Design an enzyme around this catalytic site. Structure first.
Site, short mmCIF file in Angstrom:
data_model
loop_
_atom_site.label_atom_id
_atom_site.label_comp_id
_atom_site.label_asym_id
_atom_site.label_seq_id
_atom_site.Cartn_x
_atom_site.Cartn_y
_atom_site.Cartn_z
N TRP D 47 1.04 -1.26 -0.16
CA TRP D 47 -0.09 -0.08 -0.01
C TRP D 47 1.05 1.22 0.21
CZ3 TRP D 47 -3.79 2.93 3.97
CH2 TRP D 47 -4.21 3.93 3.58
C1 LIG Z 1 -7.40 6.36 2.25
C2 LIG Z 1 -8.04 6.54 3.16
C3 LIG Z 1 -8.08 8.63 3.80
C4 LIG Z 1 -9.18 8.64 4.94
N1 LIG Z 1 -9.47 9.59 5.27
C5 LIG Z 1 -9.57 9.95 6.25
C6 LIG Z 1 -9.48 11.59 6.74
O1 LIG Z 1 -9.00 12.31 6.83
N2 LIG Z 1 -10.10 11.69 8.02
C7 LIG Z 1 -10.91 10.98 8.86
O2 LIG Z 1 -10.98 10.98 10.15
N3 LIG Z 1 -10.98 9.54 8.64
C8 LIG Z 1 -10.53 8.73 7.12
N4 LIG Z 1 -10.67 7.58 7.11
C9 LIG Z 1 -11.18 6.90 7.99
C10 LIG Z 1 -11.28 6.14 8.93
O3 LIG Z 1 -9.26 6.08 7.77
C11 LIG Z 1 -12.32 5.10 9.16
O4 LIG Z 1 -13.35 5.76 9.20
C12 LIG Z 1 -11.59 3.77 10.09
O5 LIG Z 1 -9.72 3.28 10.18
C13 LIG Z 1 -12.03 2.44 9.98
O6 LIG Z 1 -12.17 1.72 11.01
P1 LIG Z 1 -12.19 0.07 11.62
O7 LIG Z 1 -11.19 -0.23 12.51
O8 LIG Z 1 -13.44 -0.07 10.87
O9 LIG Z 1 -11.20 -0.91 10.11
P2 LIG Z 1 -9.55 -0.21 10.11
O10 LIG Z 1 -8.95 1.04 11.07
O11 LIG Z 1 -9.37 -0.25 8.35
O12 LIG Z 1 -9.23 -1.21 11.12
C14 LIG Z 1 -9.67 -2.79 10.99
C15 LIG Z 1 -8.66 -4.01 11.54
O13 LIG Z 1 -8.91 -4.88 10.81
C16 LIG Z 1 -7.97 -5.80 10.78
N5 LIG Z 1 -8.34 -7.63 9.85
C17 LIG Z 1 -9.03 -7.83 8.73
N6 LIG Z 1 -9.35 -8.64 8.87
C18 LIG Z 1 -8.89 -9.40 9.44
C19 LIG Z 1 -9.04 -10.76 10.20
N7 LIG Z 1 -10.13 -11.95 9.42
N8 LIG Z 1 -9.00 -11.18 11.78
C20 LIG Z 1 -8.08 -10.54 11.88
N9 LIG Z 1 -7.58 -8.66 12.49
C21 LIG Z 1 -8.05 -8.38 11.16
C22 LIG Z 1 -7.45 -4.82 10.26
O14 LIG Z 1 -5.36 -5.62 10.18
C23 LIG Z 1 -7.39 -3.28 11.00
O15 LIG Z 1 -6.54 -3.76 11.38
C24 LIG Z 1 -9.95 7.19 5.77
C25 LIG Z 1 -9.28 5.70 4.99
C26 LIG Z 1 -8.33 5.78 4.99
C27 LIG Z 1 -8.28 4.05 3.88
S1 SF4 Z 2 4.64 -1.45 5.66
FE1 SF4 Z 2 6.12 -1.64 4.12
S2 SF4 Z 2 5.60 -3.67 2.59
FE2 SF4 Z 2 3.91 -3.42 4.53
S3 SF4 Z 2 2.29 -2.62 2.91
FE3 SF4 Z 2 3.81 -0.23 4.09
S4 SF4 Z 2 4.98 0.20 2.57
FE4 SF4 Z 2 4.48 -1.91 1.68
#
Ligand SMILES: Cc1cc2nc3c(=O)[nH]c(=O)nc-3n(C[C@H](O)[C@H](O)[C@H](O)COP(=O)(O)OP(=O)(O)OC[C@H]3O[C@@H](n4cnc5c(N)ncnc54)[C@H](O)[C@@H]3O)c2cc1C
Ligand code: SF4
Ligand SMILES: Cc1cc2nc3c(=O)[nH]c(=O)nc-3n(C[C@H](O)[C@H](O)[C@H](O)COP(=O)(O)OP(=O)(O)OC[C@H]3O[C@@H](n4cnc5c(N)ncnc54)[C@H](O)[C@@H]3O)c2cc1C
Ligand code: SF4
Ligand code: SF4
Ligand code: SF4
Lengths: 642, 149, 642, 149
Positions: D47
Site C-alpha cells: 500500500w
Molecule cells: C485513504 C484513506 C483516507 C481516509 N481519510 C480520513 C480522514 O482524513 N479522516 C478521518 O477521520 N477518517 C478517514 N478515513 C477513514 C478511517 O480511516 C476509517 O473510518 C477507520 O479506520 C475505519 O476503522 P475500522 O476499525 O472499521 O477499520 P480499520 O481501521 O481499517 O481496522 C480494521 C482492522 O481489522 C484487521 N483485520 C481485518 N481482517 C481481519 C481478520 N480476518 N482477522 C483479524 N484482524 C483482521 C485490520 O488488520 C485492521 O487492523 C480514511 C481511510 C482511508 C483508507
Molecule cells: S509496511 Fe512497507 S511493505 Fe508493508 S504495506 Fe507498508 S510500505 Fe508496503
C-alpha cells in the site's frame, strides 16, 4: 510478470559477433515473410542472389497462424472454383468502403489480382479446402473460403523452406534494429539482432531488406490482466518490431491511427466470421434485440458508407458501442438458435454442422473451445457472450496501419508516387527497404493469402531492384558497435544496479520489461482510446499520452534484463513504445472521427470528407528527433460506384 | 496456459532437439537442466496456441485455461497425425466431445515449390507476373482491372 | 501475483491448537477495534470480565490509518473548541441527505452525541491538532478538523494497549470463521483463526464477539493492475472478513449495495478533502469547465437531494461521471490556482500553505507526494489529474454497507427493533455478536473518530449484555475440527496436486489465491458496476455475475497455498468472494438508482422514493444455502427539515 | 512498493525482533534466512504506507513508486523522531523539498487511559454514558438531540 529460474547474463564485449552477408534479407518468417522467401527464391536465380530469412521463433509455427486458421479470408474467385464468383472491381470497392473511403486502391487491386494464384498453390501443397459435393470451395461469406487449416503454417513453412533452403533460414534470432547505408542516409544496408538461445550478436549485411514482422499487440491494456493478458485476439507474438525499426530508419508510416477493434466471443476471442457469415448467427443485446436492426438508422449519417454491403466493420462496431454505452450488455451470439435453424430438425444434419462449428474454433482459437468446456457452454443449448477487445495495430487484417509503400507501375497514380525515391512495388520511402503483410499500410484485408501474396510481390520487386539499381550498401562499423552495446545494455544494467535492493524486481535504478509494459498498457488504455474510455479520446488526452510516453521512453534507457528471454522482452517493449508513440501522434493529427467503432475523437466527433479524405503519412527523423506529418489526398484509382 | 506433466515428460530423451522449446512462438517453453523436465517460463505470455502440446512426443503437455476467466475442469486434447487431427473436448461437467479433422492432403515434406513452372527470365522480371502466373490464377489471361475514368 | 521464496506447509492434524477463553472477543485491532478494547476495559471491571483483542497484523500500524490521517473527519463541536460549532440535528440531516435519504438516524445521532468526547481524548493522549493563533481547532470543512496525524494509529494503539493490557492482545492471528452456540443456531460462541508466524490454530471461546475487521477492498479490478494493484484508495488490508464470518453466521446485512466510489487524485489517490474544503480548489474538465456548475442542472431532478448543501457526494460523483462519459477528461484539480488565490501575492503566506498542502499528503497518502515527485509535478505551477477509483465496500466512510445493528434504547424506533432478538446497542441479529466501524452498516460518516466511538458504544453494550443476560454459549467441537481441517486444506491440496505440473502456479486441480482474486476482480469489474462499464450494470449482468461467482465459489474448495502468508491470502480471498456475492445480490434486489455516481442500474435509472425509500436487509442461511431479502422502510427519527 | 537496501539491512540481528516484519500491515516484509536480510515478499500488495520505512532502525528501507504509473527518480524519505517527523521529497528532475511536522505532543508510552475518570458502577452501566462522559464531551450534561415529533 516474469520470474526467471536463473540468470543468463552477458556483457556486450563478451558476446561473439556473427556476420551474415546476403542480398535479400527477410525479417520475420510469418505468412508474408514466407511468401517473400518463396517468391524471392524463384527470381533470385537470375542474378545468383542470396535470400536470407530471419525469424525470432521457429517458422514451422511462428506468427498469427500458429494454431492454424479456419478459413482463407481473401479469395476472389475469378473462374468459379468456389460457390461464389467475384470481380476485382467489386473487391476494391468493398475494401475502400470498409475503410470508410480511405484505401490505396492501386495496392489493393494489386494484391487482389494475384491472391487467387496463391490460394491455388496452397491447395496444391496440401492445404485441405472445404468442398461441396460438387467439388466447389465452400464459401463462408462473400470473400472467404472455409479450410481445414490446423497445419496451415507448417504447410506454408515447408514451401518456404523448400524454396530458399534451410541453410538460409535463421531461427531464434531477434532483429531489433536496421542498419543504414554509410554511403546514403536514406538507404538500408542490413540489420542487427541477437540469438535467444545463446550469446551471439548478428550483423546482417544486405542490398534489400523486407519487413515482415507482423503487427503490434499488447500496446493496450487487455480486458484480462492476469494470466489472460496473454489471450490477445491478434498475435501476441507480434510486437511492432517492423514499425519500430522502419520508422527509426526514416521510412514513412501511413494511417497509423487506424487501429482494429475486434468484436469476438468474449474473453477467449473465438472467431465470429463463420458464425455470422456461414451459420447465419444473430447477435442480440441482453434484451433480445438484434442491434444491427435497431441501430441501423444511426448509420444514416454516414452516407454513403453506411449504405454499403456489407456494412463497414467500424460502423458495425459503432452499433455495438452504442449498445454497450446504453448498458445493454451482455451481447449474445445466439449459436443455439443458429444451429437449430440450420439443422431443420434433422439430427444427422445437426451433428454435421455441430462438428463444423467446433472445427471453426479448434482450427484457430482453441482457447474459445476450452472456455466453453470450462464454463459448461454447449452452443446448441445456450448462447455465448461477445465483446470488443482492446486495440491492435496491424495492416493485413481489418486494420490498415503500416508503412507507406509504393505500388505497381501499371496501377499507381502519380498522386501516390511523389514520396518514393525509387518506384519499386512495396518499397518504403527508404531505398532498398520493403514492407509487407502487417508492415505495409493502406492496403488491408490481405489476411493469410493476401499477406503471403504481398510478400511474393515485394520479393520479385526486391530482385528487380537489386538487378536494376545494383546497390552496394556499406554498414557503419561504428554504429554497429554502438548497437551491440545497446543490445546487451539491459543485462549490464541489471548486474550494475541489482545490489541496490534485496529484490530483483523492485529497484530504483531500472525497470524490467514486464514493468515497462504494464506502464505502456496503462498509458495507452487511459489516454489513447483504449477500453478504459470505450475507445474515446481527445486532443488533451493524446497530448498527455505523449508526455507520459516521453517519461517511459527516457526510462527505457534504464531497462534491465536477467536472461536472453527477458532481453528479447526488453527490445519487444522498446519496439512497442515507439509504435505506441506513432499511433498517438497519428490520432492527434487527424482532426475527425472517420472510424467510429474503432475510436472516437470526442473533440472532432464527425467524419470530415471535405478536409480529411486523405491518407495521413508521417516521418520520424532520428537525428533531429522530429516527427513530420503530411496529408495525401485519396484518389479513386479503380472504376466502381456505390 | 500450457503446463508440463512431470510423469510423462522425459526432457526429450536422446532426440536431437527439445520439441516444446523448439516450437513455441513466444519462447516460453524451456528445460530445467536440473529436473531434465520442461516448463512454461512465462505463462501470462502464453497464447494457448497448443503448438507445444501437439509437438510433444510424450503427450506430456496440456493446457489449463487462463485463471482470469476459466473455471477449473475443462480440457482440449489434440492427437495430431499426418493427414488428420483428433480432438477430445472435456467439459467441467464431465461432458466429452470427440472430433477429427483433416490437416493435409499430401505427404509431409513433398512440396515442390515451382513444380511445372517455366524458368525465370530477365524479360519476365520486368512484368507484373509472379511465379506460375498467369496459369496458376486459373483465368484465361492475367486478371485485368478497370481503372477509374 | 505471489512467488514464495520457499514452502511453509502444514497438515491440519500436525498443527497444535491453542484454546483461548474470554468474555469479550474483539476481532480487528484497527480504529473501531481499539475503541472497543479501550471502553470494554473500563466497564469489564464490574464483572471481572476478560477482554481479548485479536489482530491479523500489528495494532501499532494496522488498518486504514497505517500512514496516519491528515484530518479527523467527524467532530461536531458543541462548545466552540474549533473554528465552527455545529448541532447534532444538523449533522443527522447532513448524513441522511448525503445518503440520498437513507440512514439509520438513531445510530448516526448516537455516535454523533459521543464522538467529540473521543476526539478530546485523542488530543489529551498526544495527537497534535492544527490550531489557530487563538487556540481553536482548525476546520477543514464544516465537520472535519486538521491534525498532524502521522502517528494517529500508534497513539490510539497505545491507548488500547494501556487499557486492555498487552497480554490480552493477539497479533499476527488471522480470524477466518465464527463459532456459534451448539445449542442456539442464532447465538455466537467464539471464533477460529490461525497464526501467520507459526503453525498454530486458535479457538477463541467468548460470550460476546465484536466484528471490527474494517471493510472490503480488492473485490473490484483497480485502475492499475500491475504493482499498483496495491494502490487501492481504501485500506488494502481490509478484505471483508467481518462481512464473511458474520453473514455466514446468519447476521443480517444492510445497504450492502451501497459501495463508495472515491474521487481522488489520479493513480495515487491522494486526498481531495483539504484541497476542496480548505484550499478552495476547483475541479475542471479538459476544457476548463467547472462541472459542479455546468452540470448543476442535471441534479435538479433529484428532490430534495439535488438542492442540498453540500451536494450529496454521489451526486457530485454523478457530475464527473457525465464529464467522463462525454469524454471531457482529463479532469483537473487546479491546485496552482487554488494556492495563488489563497496566498494573494504574499510569498511567505504561499510558503506556509504550500507546506500545509504537502502535509495533507505526507500525513496519510505518501504515494501521491511520491507520484508528484516522479512526474515532476509542482502543485504551485501545474494542476493534477483526478479520477474516481474502483468500488469499495465499507460502512465507516462515505459508504454505509455493513451489518444491520441495533441502536440505543432512547433513540431507536420500534420500526427498527423488529429483527433483533436482544436489544443491545450495535448488536447484530445474531445474539452476542456486535459489529462496529466498517462492519456496522446504515450509519456512515463515522470515519476515524466515529469508528473508535462506535467501538466504545458496542463495548459497553457487550459488557451490559454479558452481565444482564449472563450468556454462556458452547462451541461445537465437531465443527471446530471441521474448521481446523478447512483452515489448512489449501496447504494439503498444494502438496497433494503439485506433482501434476512442473510449474507450481499452473495446475489443473487448484487455484492459488492471487489467481482466484484476479478472477473475482474481473467478474465484479465487468458485471457488478465496476470501472469497466463506468459503474453501470443491470439485471442481466448481475445475474451473470452470480453465475460466475458460483463457479468461483465452487473452485474455492480447490484453493491451494504454499506458505502461511498465502494461506491468509487464501482466506482473505474466500472472504472477498462472499462479500462480492452479497454485494451483487443487494444491487440486484434494489430496483432503482438512488446513488448515481456510485452505481447506475440502466434498467431502473431513476430514484424511487415511492417504493424504495427503505433499507435493504438480507440474511444468508448457511444450512439451507438460501438468501432472503426484506425492505425496512426509512423513518425520520431526529427532528430536522430540508 | 518498499525495497530493502542490502548494504544497510543487518537483519535486525542486534534487536529482540525484526522491525519491518513486525510492523507491516499486510504481512509483506520478511527475512531471507539465507542472507539474513529483509525483502518485500509480495510488492503488488504493498500500500506504500511507509510503516516499514519509518520503523527500520537502519534506514535500510525505501519506496520505489509503483511501476504502473511512476517514472523513475522520485523519492520521499522520512526521518521520524519522538515529537516530529522530517520529510525530504526528491523530484525526478533533482528538485528537493524538505518538511517537518509534529507527530505527538506527549511522551511515548505516557497515556493513562482513564485518568480522572470515576470508577464504573452497575447503575452507570445501564445509561447511555461512555467512560468520562458527559464531561469529556465538553458539556456538564449529556448532549441532547431532538427527536422528531
Ligand atoms: C485513504 C484513506 C483516507 C481516509 N481519510 C480520513 C480522514 O482524513 N479522516 C478521518 O477521520 N477518517 C478517514 N478515513 C477513514 C478511517 O480511516 C476509517 O473510518 C477507520 O479506520 C475505519 O476503522 P475500522 O476499525 O472499521 O477499520 P480499520 O481501521 O481499517 O481496522 C480494521 C482492522 O481489522 C484487521 N483485520 C481485518 N481482517 C481481519 C481478520 N480476518 N482477522 C483479524 N484482524 C483482521 C485490520 O488488520 C485492521 O487492523 C480514511 C481511510 C482511508 C483508507
Ligand atoms: S509496511 Fe512497507 S511493505 Fe508493508 S504495506 Fe507498508 S510500505 Fe508496503
Ligand atoms: C486470431 C486471428 C484470426 C485470424 N483469422 C483469419 C482467418 O480466418 N483467415 C485468414 O486468411 N486470415 C486470418 N488472420 C490473419 C492472418 O493470420 C494475417 O493476415 C497474417 O498472418 C499476417 O502475416 P504477417 O506476415 O504480417 O504476420 P505473421 O504471420 O504474424 O508473421 C510475423 C513474423 O514475424 C516474426 N517476428 C516479429 N518480430 C520479429 C523480430 N523483431 N525479429 C525476427 N522475427 C520477428 C513473428 O515471430 C512471425 O513469425 C487472423 C489472425 C489472428 C491473429
Ligand atoms: S517436448 Fe515433451 S517430453 Fe520433450 S521436453 Fe518438452 S514436454 Fe518434455
Ligand atoms: S501454448 Fe503456444 S504460446 Fe503457450 S507455451 Fe505452448 S507453444 Fe508457447
Ligand atoms: S527493520 Fe531494517 S534492518 Fe531490520 S530487517 Fe527490516 S530492513 Fe533489515
Amino acid at each position: 510478470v516474469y520470474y526467471p529460474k536463473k540468470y543468463e547474463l552477458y556483457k556486450a564485449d563478451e558476446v561473439p559477433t556473427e556476420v551474415v552477408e546476403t542480398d535479400i534479407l527477410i525479417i520475420g518468417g510469418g505468412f508474408s515473410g514466407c511468401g517473400a522467401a518463396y517468391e524471392a527464391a524463384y527470381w533470385a536465380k537470375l542474378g545468383g542472389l542470396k535470400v536470407t530469412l530471419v525469424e525470432k521463433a521457429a517458422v514451422e509455427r511462428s506468427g498469427a497462424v500458429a494454431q492454424g486458421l479456419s478459413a482463407i479470408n481473401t479469395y476472389i474467385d475469378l473462374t468459379g472454383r468456389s460457390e461464389r464468383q467475384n470481380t476485382l472491381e467489386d473487391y476494391v470497392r468493398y475494401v475502400t468502403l470498409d475503410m470508410m473511403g480511405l484505401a490505396r486502391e492501386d495496392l489493393v487491386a494489386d494484391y487482389a489480382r494475384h491472391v487467387d494464384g496463391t490460394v491455388h498453390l496452397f491447395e496444391k501443397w496440401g492445404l485441405p479446402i472445404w468442398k461441396t459435393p460438387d467439388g466447389k470451395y465452400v464459401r463462408e461469406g462473400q470473400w472467404q473460403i472455409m479450410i481445414h487449416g490446423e497445419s496451415y503454417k507448417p504447410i506454408i513453412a515447408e514451401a518456404a523452406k523448400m524454396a530458399v533452403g534451410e541453410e538460409n533460414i535463421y531461427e531464434r534470432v531477434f532483429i531489433f534494429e536496421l542498419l543504414k547505408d554509410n554511403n546514403d542516409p536514406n538507404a538500408v544496408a542490413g540489420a542487427v539482432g541477437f540469438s535467444v538461445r545463446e550469446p551471439k550478436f548478428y550483423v546482417f549485411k544486405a542490398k534489400a531488406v523486407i519487413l515482415a514482422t507482423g503487427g503490434a499487440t499488447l500496446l493496450f491494456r487487455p480486458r484480462s490482466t492476469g494470466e489472460a493478458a496473454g489471450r490477445t485476439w491478434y498475435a501476441i507474438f507480434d510486437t511492432g518490431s517492423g514499425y519500430y525499426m522502419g520508422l527509426k530508419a526514416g521510412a514513412m508510416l501511413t494511417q497509423f491511427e487506424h487501429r482494429f477493434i475486434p468484436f469476438r466471443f468474449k474473453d477467449g476471442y473465438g472467431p465470429v466470421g463463420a458464425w455470422f457469415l456461414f451459420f447465419k448467427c444473430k447477435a442480440k443485446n441482453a434484451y433480445g434485440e438484434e442491434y444491427i436492426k435497431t441501430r441501423a438508422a444511426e448509420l444514416e449519417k454516414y452516407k454513403p458508407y453506411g449504405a454499403a454491403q456489407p456494412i463497414p466493420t467500424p460502423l458495425r462496431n459503432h452499433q455495438v458501442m452504442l449498445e454497450i454505452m446504453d448498458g445493454n450488455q451482455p451481447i449474445y451470439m445466439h449459436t443455439e438458435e443458429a444451429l437449430a435453424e440450420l439443422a431443420g430438425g434433422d439430427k444427422k444434419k445437426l451433428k454435421h454442422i455441430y462438428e463444423e462449428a467446433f472445427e471453426d474454433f479448434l482450427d484457430m482459437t482453441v482457447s474459445q473451445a476450452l472456455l466453453w468446456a470450462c464454463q459448461n457452454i454447449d452452443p446448441q443449448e445456450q448462447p455465448s457472450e461477445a465483446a470488443p477487445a482492446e486495440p491492435y495495430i496491424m495492416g493485413s487484417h481489418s486494420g490498415e496501419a503500416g508503412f507507406w509503400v509504393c505500388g505497381p507501375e501499371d496501377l499507381m497514380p502519380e498522386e501516390y508516387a511523389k514520396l518514393f525515391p525509387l518506384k519499386y512495388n512495396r518499397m518504403t520511402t527508404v531505398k532498398g527497404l520493403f514492407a509487407i503483410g502487417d508492415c505495409a499500410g493502406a492496403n488491408p484485408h490481405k489476411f493469410s493469402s493476401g499477406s503471403f501474396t504481398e510478400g511474393r510481390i515485394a520479393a520479385k520487386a526486391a530482385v528487380r531492384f537489386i538487378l536494376e539499381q545494383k546497390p552496394n550498401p556499406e554498414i557503419d562499423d561504428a554504429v554497429v558497435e554502438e548497437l551491440k552495446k545497446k543490445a546487451y545494455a539491459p543485462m549490464e544494467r541489471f548486474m550494475q544496479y541489482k545490489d541496490l535492493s534485496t529484490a530483483d524486481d523492485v529497484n530504483p535504478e531500472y525497470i524490467l520489461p514486464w514493468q515497462g509494459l504494464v506502464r505502456l498498457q496503462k498509458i495507452m488504455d487511459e489516454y489513447a482510446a483504449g477500453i478504459a474510455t470505450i475507445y474515446k479520446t481527445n486532443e488533451k488526452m493524446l497530448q498527455r499520452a505523449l508526455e507520459l510516453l516521453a517519461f517511459l521512453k527516457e526510462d527505457l534507457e534504464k531497462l534491465a534484463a536477467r536472461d536472453l528471454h527477458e532481453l528479447m522482452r526488453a527490445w519487444e517493449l522498446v519496439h512497442r513504445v515507439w509504435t505506441a508513440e506513432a499511433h498517438v501522434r497519428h490520432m492527434l493529427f487527424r482532426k475527425e472521427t472517420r472510424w467510429p467503432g474503432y475510436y472516437y475523437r470526442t473533440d472532432y466527433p464527425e467524419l470530415n470528407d471535405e478536409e480529411w479524405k486523405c491518407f495521413v503519412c508521417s516521418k520520424y527523423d532520428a537525428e533531429k528527433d522530429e516527427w513530420t506529418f503530411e496529408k495525401v489526398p485519396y484518389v479513386q484509382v479503380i472504376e466502381w460506384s456505390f | 496456459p500450457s503446463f508440463v506433466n512431470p510423469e510423462k515428460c522425459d526432457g526429450c530423451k536422446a532426440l536431437e532437439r527439445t520439441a516444446c522449446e523448439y516450437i513455441c512462438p513466444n519462447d516460453l517453453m524451456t528445460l530445467d537442466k536440473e529436473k531434465m523436465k520442461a516448463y512454461n517460463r512465462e505463462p501470462d505470455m502464453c497464447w494457448e496456441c497448443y503448438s507445444c502440446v501437439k509437438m510433444c512426443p510424450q503427450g506430456a503437455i496440456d493446457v489449463r485455461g487462463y485463471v482470469d476467466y476459466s473455471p477449473l475442469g475443462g480440457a482440449c486434447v489434440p492427437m495430431r497425425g499426418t493427414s488428420d487431427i483428433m480432438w477430445t473436448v472435456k467439459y467441467r461437467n464431465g461432458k466429452v466431445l470427440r472430433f477429427k479433422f483433416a490437416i493435409r492432403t499430401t505427404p509431409w515434406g513433398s512440396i515442390q515449390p515451382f513444380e511445372g513452372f517455366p524458368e525465370p527470365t530477365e524479360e519476365a522480371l520486368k512484368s507484373e507476373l509472379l511465379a506460375g502466373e498467369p496459369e496458376i490464377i486459373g483465368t484465361s489471361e492475367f486478371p485485368q482491372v478497370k481503372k477509374k475514368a
